[PDB]
Symmetry: C4
Subunit: 389 residues, 4 copies
């Protein structure tokens, strides 16, 4: 009955962003049984789109919320839940157990991947059709880790980018090509990106583009472009001087295409872009110093043009509100002739920026592109920290 | 498999109203995780009827309920939930994000529309089959806004009435004709209605009738009648001297067919009527001054007869209980030979009438017509405000 | 696809009773969002069996639980929920609004009936396939009321017994014959039963037997036997001197077949029996004075033999625990060659017997027959009232 | 459409264990409506795998949690719920009522068995396709009891092991062979096992292997091997000197194949093994004295070789964390050419080891085998008891 999805369409023209989903999880969880989360994303099946994140295995009001700034424990799991509801104890479906994930539907069924273990002995389990199929042991014994947003499939082949090794020098990044949860091939990273974490990917016209985080050196973002038929890839950086990691230095006039733009070391944030010629939009935090604010900038030819500057933009979160990770997804099963770019922003609340509470959590806002030039609003998390004291 | 619904039936004869649904949301939410709402309605799919409303993105007992008198924020969404259950965190399905909505099923799938943004830069997103399809930017830069109750479709064409512009003088009302979430046509309001907000619509014999709110001048209600095949409409007022907005002056002996009946300016409430010759019933608040009580009056030829008075009635909510918005819907997929008129009343609790609590919310009661002459009960919200202090 | 169910089987031989379902609702609702209920029952669809009851439109821990001894309000509804779960805010499906009900599946879909209104102006609404179809106005203007347990259908015809009029003298009982929610016929009660309330019915070999409550005079129970093909009935009393209403006098040696067995006036409890020759079992409270304890007694030929005494029995609830209403149901869609008799007991907690709390609620236990002679346990509600203070 | 499952595959090669599911129930239930449980397990249907356990009919934070160390009451039920969610009031489906259970899917539908009653008069009810079909009365009048983990079917025949009689001397164990919930045959235990409780079973190549608990004498575990076609069985003990009950004496150099290995009397814990030649893995608690820690040991030929020692292992729960019962299950409906061994560990919290709280409950962790040699983590319950004081 169902066939594997093929990436046959190009991106729709992005003239602005419209609201798609928002869960208000922190506001609602002040007085309801909402799980503490972080590292959220969005992903569609052929008949539904859902929110996803890594639970911390406690509610926000629960006493076990104390300590949830920590990224890795035995109490995390990848959960999904209905679009724009909050992640509650009673509506959250566990996809797999662990503290680093990705997930994508191939048109027939869903693959989900969760990594668990101690830092020196982690392993991935690849689930397909809600059953475990393949396992991969750590190859560098230092926090095996993956995208924290959806993967993308083409004719059953779903590439996934993993890293294992240091966060503050060269590491061992691998691109795995899965089909029905089995490994067809893997390759080591090639090209000019010097460090890769937390790739945010999308597909169009039989090519998958991933915008990642160079935690080690780069305040420009590395880009991996994957051919899922040939099962090959390239890597470079976004050439534009509109720098989109965080923290970062101020924007220069000329960026770097094949090396990290320097100025900030050993830090970053997961983020994304859509790189499609003149139809190119970059997300970034507004602040250069912290995970505050969020904006989209139209930067024609950002990938290839080392002097490209914005020609249009849209504020998503004011710089007086907290943001966080951000990532790409699309509804590959929508009607019409083109794929509509979407993204989400994780709105982090609690530690370390708001340390009067003992927890860290987030809510989600997400937007998709419009071919209209729509008015803009800002979309904060909306919770009052003082209510939790 | 499924075909678009056609409005092939006339209304059943309304000889009284029977109880259809009631959620007791405020009573139950005193000690359960019920979302704060307002602007509720009811709408049917071919296999289920559901309650809908605009959440405020907090529970009633939650500390974020403080401030929920306010109509527009980034934390509102259109939600639906099973008939007569309350809107809870765990059972409420988000249809779209925003602070003004409508929704209707065309026989194949559902269209939902939500407007969001700041007052001077709002936009509608039209969702079809649970995906975003079309967007419309504000045309007058002043609170783009729509029905707050269900739309109606005929052979796939679902007209929707929007207003943008002042609430206290001429505004720019448009009737959009959607099919599969795409715009076939729109037209500016024509006819003699001088201001339109919050239309309540129903269909019968290939005609859609909408009873709306003239916020600017009129205490009689404007009526828009739409031909969804020709995609044309007319407008006038209910001619009857039984005035049905709120607040309003006392009832005269002769009303106005083609102009606002004066006496109250710059206010109103969403309401409804069924206008079908001798089979005409009007809803209204009992109080002329405030949103208290609710009654149905049988007013033969109310639309056309400027001296028409009641010949029968039914009390729905006593004048010592709070009411609120009211609106029309029908189950277009029921058995039998005629469409059974239904309506709901929003029972508003909290601010501004009950200001010992810091929140505003509501529950729902809803009734449908019977061809019997049934005994009447009154149907209050039923919550005790003192329990929330 | 689906056909109407026919009553083609006889009862299985009842040699003891096994546990079927129990919800522990009061225990669990001490610290979860469980609705206050009373007047529960059980009813099966072709693919699932569910618990049903009349909600009071509040949780047990909620402040609106104060006052829930009262039987009739605008905040009651017939709800159903999964077998042996408790009736919670989040899992309870409302079937219809009102304070007296019955419900049954005909093999194609379900009919549910709810009565609402003030005592002098009540009305029934008959829902079929989850939509309202027919309405019936009060005929005697004194608490129109029905079974409070499931009805039974045969080839689409579902008879239902209603009463309207005094509870303490002659009233007007009617048997309605519904098909697809429409009235085929009704008849006034005939035969020798002198007053009827709250009938508990079951079907076998194309005959429906209902055991009811004579509130006015009788401590023996009236029995109505209905032919759903001819749409006729008879009535009499259980002849046995094993008296099964409550309160009641002590058991005599000879009962009454065609008149109320006297000794207690103007009170009773809903109850049931299976009347099948030697395979006859009667339920009753153990106490003659109050709704405490519950037992089944095998009383061969109880219906017809005015000296019949027990030959076997089973204790269901000890006389040191509270009971309440009880009623019959069967799974008419089970495998095998005979219908397995089942029943439920309502375990009432709170007022008036336990008046340190301000509420009245209940839980459910239910049993079905076995052809084995099984060991017996007792099945109390299990909640500690002191925990609610 | 569906056919009965046949055990046509052998076990996959077990080279390590990967995380499969974990519910964090005690952590989450500190501030959400999680039921108190014990005696959990896991079982798959053709389209889903679920967690199961015996509820205690109260939440953990509820006042009725006081006293839940006790094993048998009228308020217990077998519940199931989605894999890795916690067992909550709102998501837990009751399978049947009682205080000892087993359940398995035959490829067409599920059989569930629950035993209830007082110790001297207990009875099993066998449910098939969610309806009661057969009942079995106590044969020895002393705590009729069964596996507390899943049964296994082959071509519709689902053997189940029961015991009735003393826990501290010879008892009466029976193997029942069910098909469609009916009894085809039963046999008394034969072979050399001298006492049997709480068998943990799995199937491969048309043979079912059960590893049980000799509560009376043995610190080695008894093994029952069942031929579900011939409906015959054998019994012996695991010959290995790697002793796997608890409490137990220290490991000797030579075990016992046909008699209990002595040293500890009248106690034990439910546990499991996979016995497949060199592909043999045994679970056990790390502590010899208490239910603390959990490890898997690869013990080639453990069943048959009375000097077999470990050649590989994996720690599952550190010896500074509490464990509990453990049991086997597999997904018999997975893809591929072999059945992947899985197990669960019950992580008991509260009494008697943690007696500052008044309750006993547990959470679940579960693992399945990998053909990789994966890094290991430990998987504690994760709750802080002090938060519950
Ligand atoms: C109702 O809603 C609508 C729809 O949302 C609202 O309209 C939106 O309004 C916003 C806000 O104004 C606009 O976003 C900004 O867009 C500009 C880009 O547009 C300007 O530039 C265009 C390019 O000009 C150049 O090239 C063209 C050739 O292609 C040439 O023609 C031109 O002369 C010049 O050489 C112009 O084309 C464009 O004009 C067009 O549009 C105008 C409407 O906007 C119209 O008036 C014109 O007639 C014409 O049609 C326009 O001039 C972005 O540049 C801008 O983003 C910068 O600024 C914000 C702060 O506001 C900052 O956060 C951004 O990061 C970015 O600035 C940083 O980075 C730059 C790049 O390196 C750097 O140069 C800056 O110094 C700055 O860097 C500093 O901050 C960063 C961030 O913290 C830090 O990292 C650095 O280190 C450093 O510290 C905004 O995105 C929307 O485009 C506009 N949308 C639409 C459709 O109109 C409307 O306002 C609402 N109505 C109401 C009443 O509220
Ligand atoms: C069990 O349940 C049943 C079923 O519900 C209960 O029966 C229901 O009882 C109620 C309450 O009585 C009825 O509702 C009222 O209905 C009347 C209309 O019916 C009267 O008028 C009919 C028309 O008479 C005129 O025309 C005919 C020709 O067509 C001519 O024949 C006649 O002589 C005259 O010229 C009569 O036909 C009708 O008689 C029939 O029915 C009688 C039963 O009701 C029966 O006894 C008769 O034999 C005959 O069969 C009857 O006389 C509505 O007028 C009325 O609503 C007005 O009053 C309420 C206050 O009660 C008010 O809230 C309404 O807004 C409305 O009055 C306001 O507006 C008017 C219009 O502008 C204005 O004129 C009024 O001054 C008033 O205005 C003021 O208040 C408003 C609102 O606050 C404010 O805006 C203004 O500014 C101003 O301040 C009720 O709807 C049901 O129809 C009736 N149903 C049935 C089927 O019987 C039964 O009672 C229950 N039993 C028990 C024991 O409780
Ligand atoms: C493990 O579980 C098993 C299975 O559950 C347990 O076994 C069950 O045990 C219970 C309790 O004993 C039994 O229930 C009682 O059953 C008797 C009926 O059986 C007796 O009578 C039979 C009829 O005898 C007469 O007729 C036959 C001819 O048909 C003739 O042969 C005979 O001589 C005589 O003329 C006997 O056949 C039967 O014997 C058989 O079974 C015996 C086992 O029980 C066995 O030992 C024998 O060999 C033989 O095989 C037996 O003698 C019911 O009468 C009884 O119910 C009455 O008593 C209870 C109080 O205990 C009361 O609550 C009931 O309401 C009822 O008594 C009231 O009503 C009567 C009727 O009007 C009245 O006469 C009484 O005075 C009394 O009235 C007072 O109280 C009521 C209520 O408050 C009030 O309204 C009145 O006004 C008044 O104040 C019990 O139901 C089960 O049948 C039995 N089941 C099985 C399969 O064995 C086993 O015990 C458990 N094991 C353990 C270790 O716990
Ligand atoms: C990243 O993750 C990986 C993967 O998990 C981690 O690697 C795992 O590391 C663990 C911990 O070391 C290993 O588990 C232990 O495995 C050993 C078995 O392996 C040893 O023995 C093998 C057999 O040797 C004998 O036979 C062979 C012939 O077949 C012969 O060649 C040999 O000379 C000898 O005669 C060796 O083959 C094996 O070597 C191989 O593997 C090595 C890696 O482990 C490698 O270095 C070698 O080159 C070679 O490749 C190895 O030597 C188990 O014996 C052991 O379990 C015992 O000990 C633990 C305590 O640690 C205890 O809890 C167990 O119960 C058990 O000991 C009890 O029972 C025994 C049996 O009766 C008894 O003899 C003991 O005295 C003891 O009894 C006491 O305690 C019990 C329990 O409380 C009580 O009941 C008794 O009464 C008494 O008080 C562990 O299971 C994994 O196998 C290994 N996995 C893999 C794939 O490598 C890696 O460490 C992680 N990395 C980091 C950085 O953390
Ligand atoms: C995606 O492209 C693949 C490759 O062309 C399509 O695969 C074919 O699908 C049909 C079944 O629908 C098979 O009978 C062919 O044998 C397949 N060919 C190959 C080369 O695998 C697939 O159908 C396309 N997906 C969609 C949604 O059309
Ligand atoms: C119950 O009995 C009725 C009456 O005999 C059966 O009704 C017939 O059903 C078939 C469809 O399955 C029709 O084509 C006939 O016309 C029906 N006859 C009548 C007289 O109504 C019904 O099928 C029986 N129900 C079951 C479950 O067999
Ligand atoms: Ca960086
Ligand atoms: Ca007005
Ligand atoms: Ca709560
Ligand atoms: Ca009586
Ligand atoms: Ca033992």
């Amino acid at each position: 009955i169902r066939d594997f999805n093929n990436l046959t369409k190009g991106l729709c023209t992005i003239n602005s962003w419209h609201i798609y989903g928002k869960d208000n999880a922190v506001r609602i969880g002040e007085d309801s049984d909402v799980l503490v989360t972080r590292e959220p994303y969005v992903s569609c099946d052929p008949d539904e789109c859902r929110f996803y994140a890594l639970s911390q295995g406690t509610t926000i009001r629960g006493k076990h919320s104390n300590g949830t700034i920590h990224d890795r424990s035995q109490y995390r799991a990848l959960i999904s839940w209905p679009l724009s509801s909050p992640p509650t104890v009673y509506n959250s479906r566990v996809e797999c157990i662990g503290w680093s994930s990705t997930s994508c539907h191939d048109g027939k069924t869903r693959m989900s991947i969760c990594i668990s273990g101690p830092n020196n002995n982690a392993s991935a389990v690849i689930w397909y059709n809600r059953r475990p199929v393949t396992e991969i042991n750590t190859w560098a014994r230092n926090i095996l880790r993956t995208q924290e947003s959806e993967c993308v499939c083409h004719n059953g082949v779903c590439p996934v980018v993993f890293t294992d090794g240091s966060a503050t020098g060269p590491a061992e990044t691998r691109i795995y090509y899965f089909k029905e949860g089995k490994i067809l091939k893997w390759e080591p990273l090639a090209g000019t990106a010097k460090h890769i974490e937390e790739c945010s990917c999308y597909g169009e016209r039989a090519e998958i583009t991933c915008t990642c985080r160079d935690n080690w050196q780069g305040s420009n973002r590395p880009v991996i472009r994957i051919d899922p038929v040939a099962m090959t890839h390239t890597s470079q950086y976004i050439c534009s001087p509109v720098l989109t990691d965080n923290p970062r230095p101020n924007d220069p006039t000329v960026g770097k295409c094949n090396d990290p733009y320097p100025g900030n070391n050993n830090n970053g944030v997961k983020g994304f872009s859509y790189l499609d010629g003149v139809n190119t939009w970059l997300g970034r935090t507004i602040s250069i110093a912290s995970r505050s604010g969020y904006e989209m900038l139209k930067v024609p030819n950002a990938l290839t043009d080392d002097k490209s500057k914005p020609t249009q933009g849209q504020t998503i979160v004011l710089n007086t509100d907290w943001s966080g990770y951000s990532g790409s997804f699309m509804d590959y099963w929508a009607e019409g002739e083109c794929y509509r770019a979407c993204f989400y922003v994780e709105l982090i609340r609690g530690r370390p920026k708001e340390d009067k509470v003992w927890w860290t959590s987030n809510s989600i806002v997400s937007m998709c592109s419009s071919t209209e030039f729509l008015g803009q609003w800002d979309w904060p998390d909306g919770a009052k920290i003082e209510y939790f004291l």
